[PDB]
Design a protein around this ligand. Structure first.
Ligand SMILES: NCCCCCC(=O)O
Ligand SMILES: NCCCCCC(=O)O
Lengths: 384, 384
């Protein structure tokens, strides 16, 4: 058992509705107004082909930028300097207002929600996960603190060999609805998390998407709100965004916090703007000045043993769901597979959003090219 | 085999991507920008509880209208007189701009798309279905004309006992993704349609949702466009709608034409406005004056043997995916289970939209109450 979870709608029974009951009362009143949450759906455009390149200023300093963006399968690219959009690019077939999957950049958004609750005193990072989710007792999350989840410093037996159906990464997807279910799989994401084990050691960084979903679960237990709603109330609704964001949900309606959020490039930039504004957004304060300061400061360097990151950023680290380069510019970034970045350049008070679709989720090749672009663009914003 | 179908994206292989391949190239470029079409997803509101009742004028003539709307589980109600919104109502929890499932009102939209193609001369209603979908040879659709599909005058062995998994109505849902698949079920909607049989007789009305999906299939074969896109190009994109509409899609990306469209009440009214404007919309002509005239004229009365309809509307009929009351006002309406109506009142140049969630899909009780409201509101618009 995974305990109490926020009802899909007021008064809903546990797990209701399902794909086989949404047409029945009392579920249908809610379902008829939110069918996309139950059945895959397509948009029928209200609007009646070519790449849009408005690199403006930085174009002079980076003449071959558009070609570099194409080479890195860029779908949407946007540079926000201060409160102004100084550069934009969208591939042919992708409109400026189209939404794009954020993959793990979603984690940085989740960490932000957790930070908001810490600022309210509803979550104490020093407390064990079990203080908020008792049902995680007996799992690898029995013992570690919420901060250790936030910094991903928990050793977990997490097979990353996706090709293997028995692997935790593929099992995670099947439990959440990102892949076809197999007989015996956990019923939902909550159940999947309870099956995770580890040797008990903590302190060393181990990137694991399950950590973010545990954070979302904690958010639900502390607020009583579905993660989908908490993400809106504590973050999205305060950004004065152009469009709603979306997030995939599993069979119980639990949002895939670790990587299922989609939004426009311009709106994602609003998240970066909030971070560079000390945690304040147009709709009010999202997180405390201290929270933002700690994110920019970085995590323990000694905990960061991922050569894939440190070979490029030797003094890099990770904290509160953000990757910290530790470079001379103090760059910090939300990162997602296939080329997604919510890159912060505090030196120039700028935010760089790059949403892509590399053929591969991760290769040294793509990252070298991607980081080269982000660093070059950041430097092009420097006063000269 | 069901033959050629519009690719999910340019150059896509048949049936690609699937829930298990969308993260792979070359599918991911498209999938990352349209994930809702693959995995159930929820909206994360950009906006930070009580029913909204603005019945205005008709309120004086119908004092207990709000109570009547509540009694019929009304979610959204809107009256458009001419080009003006003269009355509105939205239940607590449903915003004016929220979208609502249309159920079979979706059929009237599909019929409109077919009409647009008839006006272009790309579809001849007198031609047999097999002229456009040869793969339907050997099925109940082998012999009947496209017009007979439009008017639903084809005898089909269609078990309406949903509770029975072997029934065609439940099988239709499972084949399209509206319900959980069972071993042995057709792979997609196209395949399901090819399994349908009948005694060969035609001429008598038999309401069958499979007919509308055959129309959508014909639309795809004649245009080369996914039904989702054809619905936009030939109808939605010409309405100057406030929001995109949505439509559930099966595993191949085929829109559930018979009942999976969702849209706002105000935008649905734009469809009615187009009909009362002789087939013309703000973005251009949608269907011919003749098509609209034939819809308002009604179908053969003798073909209409559904007592559920004729007990209320003795001179009623059905044609081109619209229900024609044949009453003294010449009312015609798109109708969907659980209380959905796109009601046309040509006498007052008005359109009445009522989107609801009755606990039951259909009962004489609900229809009596629902029609009573639509007729009373129509009469309240008469000059006095
Ligand atoms: N297994 C779902 C993928 C989650 C995204 C992971 C990442 O972007 O690093
Ligand atoms: N089997 C899917 C339901 C389709 C709606 C039918 C109707 O509204 O009459």
């Amino acid at each position: 058992s995974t305990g109490q979870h926020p009802a899909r709608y007021p008064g809903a029974a546990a797990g209701e509705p399902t794909l086989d009951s949404w047409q029945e009362p009392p579920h249908n009143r809610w379902a008829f107004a939110h069918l996309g949450e139950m059945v895959p759906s397509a948009a029928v455009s209200r609007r009646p082909g070519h790449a849009l390149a408005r690199l403006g200023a930085i174009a002079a300093q980076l003449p071959d930028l558009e070609q570099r963006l194409e080479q890195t399968y860029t779908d949407a690219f946007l540079v926000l300097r201060g409160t102004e959009v100084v550069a934009e690019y969208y591939r042919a077939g992708f409109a400026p207002d189209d939404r794009h999957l954020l993959m793990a950049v979603s984690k940085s958004l989740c960490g932000t929600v957790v930070g908001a609750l810490v600022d309210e005193g509803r979550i104490d990072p020093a407390q064990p996960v079990t203080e908020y989710v008792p049902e995680l007792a007996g799992s690898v999350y029995d013992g570690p603190s919420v901060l250790q989840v936030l910094d991903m410093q928990i050793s977990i037996d997490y097979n990353e060999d996706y090709v293997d159906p028995a692997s935790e990464v593929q099992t995670h997807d099947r439990s959440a609805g990102w892949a076809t279910r197999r007989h015996g799989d956990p019923a939902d994401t909550y159940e999947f998390l309870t099956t995770l084990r580890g040797d008990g050691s903590t302190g060393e960084f181990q990137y694991c998407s399950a950590n973010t979903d545990v954070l979302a679960w904690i958010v639900e237990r502390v607020t009583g709100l579905r993660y989908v709603e908490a993400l809106s109330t504590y973050l999205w609704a305060k950004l004065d965004a152009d469009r709603d964001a979306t997030i995939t949900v599993d069979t119980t309606g639990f949002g895939f916090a670790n990587g299922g959020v989609s939004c426009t490039a311009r709106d994602l930039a609003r998240v970066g703007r909030m971070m560079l504004d000390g945690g304040v957004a147009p709709g009010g304060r999202v997180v405390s000045e201290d929270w933002v300061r700690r994110v920019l400061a970085g995590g323990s360097h000694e905990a960061m043993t991922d050569k894939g990151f440190t070979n490029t950023f030797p003094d890099g680290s990770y904290t509160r769901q953000w990757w910290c380069t530790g470079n001379e510019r103090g760059n910090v970034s939300g990162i997602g597979i296939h080329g997604q970045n919510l890159w912060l350049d505090p030196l120039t008070d700028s935010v760089i959003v790059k949403l892509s679709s590399w053929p591969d989720p991760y290769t040294e090749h793509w990252h070298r090219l991607q980081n080269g672009i982000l660093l070059d663009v950041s430097r092009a914003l420097d006063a000269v």
